[PDB]
Design a protein around this nucleic acid. Structure first.
Ligand SMILES: Nc1nc2c(ncn2[C@@H]2O[C@H](COP(=O)(O)OP(=O)(O)OP(=O)(O)O)[C@@H](O)[C@H]2O)c(=O)[nH]1
Ligand SMILES: *C(=O)[C@H](CCSC)NC=O
Ligand SMILES: [K+]
Ligand SMILES: [K+]
Ligand SMILES: [K+]
Ligand SMILES: [K+]
Ligand SMILES: [K+]
Ligand SMILES: [K+]
Ligand SMILES: [K+]
Ligand SMILES: [Mg+2]
Ligand SMILES: [Mg+2]
Ligand SMILES: [Mg+2]
Ligand SMILES: [Mg+2]
Ligand SMILES: [Mg+2]
Ligand SMILES: [Mg+2]
Ligand SMILES: [Mg+2]
Ligand SMILES: [Mg+2]
Ligand SMILES: [Mg+2]
Ligand SMILES: [Mg+2]
Ligand SMILES: [Mg+2]
Ligand SMILES: [Mg+2]
Ligand SMILES: [Mg+2]
Ligand SMILES: [Mg+2]
Ligand SMILES: [Mg+2]
Ligand SMILES: [Mg+2]
Ligand SMILES: [Mg+2]
Ligand SMILES: [Mg+2]
Lengths: 127, 394, 108
RNA sequence: AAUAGGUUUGGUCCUAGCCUUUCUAUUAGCUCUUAGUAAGAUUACACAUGCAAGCAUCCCCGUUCCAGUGAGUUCACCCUCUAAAUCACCACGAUCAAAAGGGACAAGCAUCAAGCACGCAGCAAUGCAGCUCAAAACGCUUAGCCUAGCCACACCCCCACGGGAAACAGCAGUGAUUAACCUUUAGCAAUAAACGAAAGUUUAACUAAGCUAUACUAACCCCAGGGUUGGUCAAUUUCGUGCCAGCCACCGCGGUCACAC
């Protein structure tokens, strides 16, 4: 049996009920291009970043630890809406607990809105 | 919406053990010049502190600095917290799970076992390719050997010498010229997720027949000398995405002839990528019909001791011009393609014959046979800029 | 030579030892450009797998891939080392198996 | 080059080169139990952050030291003379030691052979026409050295008024780059330095720890791998391949009996 011994580090088994302590939710703002994802995030972040961007397009996934007025803390993952960043949207859906789908009323459902919904179904996260 | 989000989260009853080896996921990974290799991550189990040894795929780290979105150091990262982590000995891929290990030698042991597994998976893939190359060669070897029987090798070389006296092969240059329609690109990006996005767009290229897109090297960070050297080696083009190139790097590219193309928007960098592909494409000639004339009588003229066949033609629709190219048409078939050697009308050379003008037509090709009913269609050829067929979906 | 002749000249000056393709360095890093084959000089007959790589120094040399079979393609990264290939004239560099893209020869 | 060996030829002798056996140091691959000690960026490329020089009844002193690096490179040694400095102080001489003067001092290339004002006398005016060099002048390239250590540099322009311009060749750490990859520890308890009349304070010097088969020392109930196996050169069973695939430091092997793959 001259085979390399397995020395990998694996994920710990699911936490025991006793150990489990309540934690903050992770939320992702998913949607189509120029449907207001960043503008919505800014109002809760209380900071304006939309104007301070190249072309006003979100090309990165950023996690911000917002503190709600009630005293709760939420982590907002602002995903890009452009078609190029399909991988970024899938990765956001895999670490999120809730998906806030921003569907603009004027335009409605779009190609990337359906894609955002599909990623949520695969991750099985409430929308 | 804020109330609805809070309500649903409470219904979900989210809970995570806050103690024990840290678990997490990488959200972004990038290179900082001052802070080094940095990965933004979200904690999922346990609490992260300075000095925690972390493994993520083929990269491990010992937490040196923990900072928040604003850069302020944080002492602890409880579950479901965003936290930039420094101290990575290699750059983790985006989306890779993070696990905490007891010590640095244990981390290196874990990484050494993940690299080995990757090498075995590549090795098995390589084996099928090699077995294919080695099976083909063994057939060509058994065939040429079995050309003659299992006779003494001295005879086979002598019998082959008989057919070696009939053999004259030419060796092809070991280094062959890259064809004009080949675009080599170096992709450099600010963050790893941005680079993967551009690489997925380069995997949606379907017009390889007209022009080929080669990816020489991809990486994260500013343009470097190696990128300029790799671009000069393969005559490639460096595309920067939200990255900078210094005067030393930009000046070096001028001497080496490399083209650095720094962009900041992904639709801009793709449009420019398509403009370079279009340039490589071959110029699409546009054929515009100029005139049409039907032959009537064929004459044999003796000039300079040479018999010149002359096609007498009547221009029906349009006009014929000496410069514009011609083609011969036989009952719908295309017999010839070329230019007239001599255009002469009524013993006078006329460059442009109008509709209804009689003109004798002699071709430069003597093998062309002129009948009573042949047709000739003149045309003007204009090269037209050809655009790449590849569309990226946006 | 006489003692007076030996005094004028002086200690024998050892010719400066020449450097090889590695520039006096153990190994070097290079990028694969081509992947061809070469035939040995008489009396050996074979097709030997070689590759033209551009080193980090800037030069572009021909290297020999040892072992049975390989999957080296253009743009890959390989670590070269010294060691002449006796059959092949002008081949002075050898690719390091098990380093960078190049992988160990699969068993059997 | 040694106690030597192998290899020129059809063969012998002679000569001669290449290689082998020895010992180290990097790096690579495969592999790896512990303990203690030593040593520990590839790069004079660019540097986030934090710390690294204070003391003290106000003046002064100190931060010109240590620590660091190796770009450049005959300022380092001896003699003469003689400042600053210590010996509380005037004085004394001693000690230490710069500048100045004399001497000495790397390697390669002569396909660098001539340099071009490099000398003397005289109080001065000024006069004479010399001076160095095939025993290597002038010059070019390379390099830190002669190691209780020393020299030199201190982002660059030898220098630093000035300018470019905005400096980790201080510790830790990073980016780029390279075959080359140490912790963004603690404490002033010991020694050293600074300040102070002093108790004392300070110090990323240092001490004590951390990482790492680089090296040495020691050990272990369990726990061994790596490379060799034609000769040189210690040591191969049986298959498979069939001048193919592949191998060797050298000579060489493989064409259906391969101690060489
Ligand atoms: N009138 C109006 N304009 C809005 C509203 N929400 C957003 N916008 C505008 O829509 C545009 C796009 O806003 P962004 O915040 O960039 O939208 P996004 O969906 O995050 O964009 P990507 O990141 O490119 O996908 C901006 O000009 C906003 O001012 C709204 O409720 N009303
Ligand atoms: C030749 O001269 C040409 C022949 C026409 S046959 C109908 N006519 C005029 O130039
Ligand atoms: K936009
Ligand atoms: K042979
Ligand atoms: K030096
Ligand atoms: K200087
Ligand atoms: K002390
Ligand atoms: K004082
Ligand atoms: K056999
Ligand atoms: Mg946005
Ligand atoms: Mg040989
Ligand atoms: Mg012989
Ligand atoms: Mg000999
Ligand atoms: Mg010193
Ligand atoms: Mg004195
Ligand atoms: Mg002196
Ligand atoms: Mg010459
Ligand atoms: Mg030097
Ligand atoms: Mg200076
Ligand atoms: Mg510096
Ligand atoms: Mg440092
Ligand atoms: Mg680094
Ligand atoms: Mg080392
Ligand atoms: Mg301290
Ligand atoms: Mg220590
Ligand atoms: Mg080793
Ligand atoms: Mg064998």
């Amino acid at each position: 049996d001259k085979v390399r011994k397995n020395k990998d580090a694996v994920r710990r088994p699911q936490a025991d009920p006793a150990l489990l302590t309540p934690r903050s939710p992770v939320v992702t703002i998913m949607g189509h291009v120029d449907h207001g994802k960043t503008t919505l995030l800014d109002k809760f972040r209380k900071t304006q970043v939309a104007a301070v961007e190249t072309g006003g397009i979100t090309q990165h996934i950023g996690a911000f630890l917002v503190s709600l007025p009630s005293g709760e803390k939420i982590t907002f993952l602002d995903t890009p809406g452009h078609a190029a960043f399909s991988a970024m949207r899938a990765r956001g859906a895999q670490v999120t607990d809730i998906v806030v789908l921003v569907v603009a009323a004027d335009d409605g459902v779009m190609k990337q809105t359906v894609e955002s919904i599909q990623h949520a179904k695969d991750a099985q996260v409430p929308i | 919406l804020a109330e609805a989000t809070v309500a649903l989260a409470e219904m979900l009853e989210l809970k995570a053990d806050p103690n024990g080896p840290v678990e997490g996921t990488v959200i972004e990974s990038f290179t900082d010049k001052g802070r080094g290799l940095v990965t933004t991550a979200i904690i999922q189990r346990g609490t992260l502190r300075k000095g925690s040894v972390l493994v993520a795929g083929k990269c491990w780290a010992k937490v040196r600095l923990m900072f928040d979105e604003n850069g302020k150091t944080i002492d602890e990262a409880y579950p479901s917290m965003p936290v930039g982590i420094t101290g990575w000995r290699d750059l983790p891929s985006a989306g890779e799970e993070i696990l905490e290990v007891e010590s640095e030698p244990r981390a290196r042991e874990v990484v050494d076992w993940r690299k080995y597994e990757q090498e075995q998976e590549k090795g098995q893939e390589d084996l099928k390719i090699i077995e294919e190359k080695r099976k083909e060669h063994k057939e060509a070897h058994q065939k040429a050997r079995e050309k003659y029987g299992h006779l003494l090798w001295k005879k086979r070389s002598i019998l082959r010498f008989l057919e070696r006296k009939e053999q004259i092969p030419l060796k092809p240059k070991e280094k062959r010229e890259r064809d004009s329609n080949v675009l080599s690109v170096i992709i450099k990006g600010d963050v790893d997720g941005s680079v993967e996005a551009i690489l997925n767009i380069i995997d949606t290229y379907d017009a390889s027949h007209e022009c080929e897109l080669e990816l020489v090297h991809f990486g994260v960070g500013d343009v470097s000398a190696n990128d300029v050297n790799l671009a000069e080696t393969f005559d490639g083009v460096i595309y920067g995405f939200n990255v900078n190139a210094g005067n030393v790097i930009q000046q070096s590219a001028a001497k080496k002839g490399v083209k650095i193309k720094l962009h900041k928007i992904i639709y801009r960098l793709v449009e420019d990528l398509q403009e370079e592909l279009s340039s490589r494409l071959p110029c699409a000639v546009e054929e515009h019909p100029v005139g049409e004339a039907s032959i009537l009588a064929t004459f044999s003229v003796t000039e300079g001791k040479k018999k010149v066949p002359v096609a007498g033609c009547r221009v029906q629709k349009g006009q014929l011009e000496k410069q514009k190219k011609f083609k011969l048409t036989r009952n719908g078939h295309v017999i010839w393609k070329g230019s007239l050697t001599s255009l002469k009308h009524h013993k006078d050379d006329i460059s442009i014959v109008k509709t209804g003008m009689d003109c004798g037509l002699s071709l430069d090709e003597d093998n062309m046979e002129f009948q009573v009913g042949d047709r000739i269609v003149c045309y003007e050829e204009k090269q037209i800029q050809a655009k790449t067929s590849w569309d990226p979906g946006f | 030579a006489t003692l007076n002749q030996m005094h004028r000249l002086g200690p024998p000056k050892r010719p400066p030892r020449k450097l090889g393709p590695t520039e006096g360095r153990p190994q070097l890093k290079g990028v694969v450009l081509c992947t061809f084959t070469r035939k040995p000089k008489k009396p050996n007959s074979a097709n030997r797998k070689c590759c033209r790589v551009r080193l980090s120094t800037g030069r572009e040399a021909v290297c020999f891939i040892p072992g049975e079979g390989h999957t080296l393609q253009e743009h890959q990264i390989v670590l070269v080392e010294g060691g002449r290939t006796q059959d092949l004239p002008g081949v002075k560099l050898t690719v390091v198996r098990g380093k960078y893209d190049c992988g160990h020869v699969q068993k059997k």
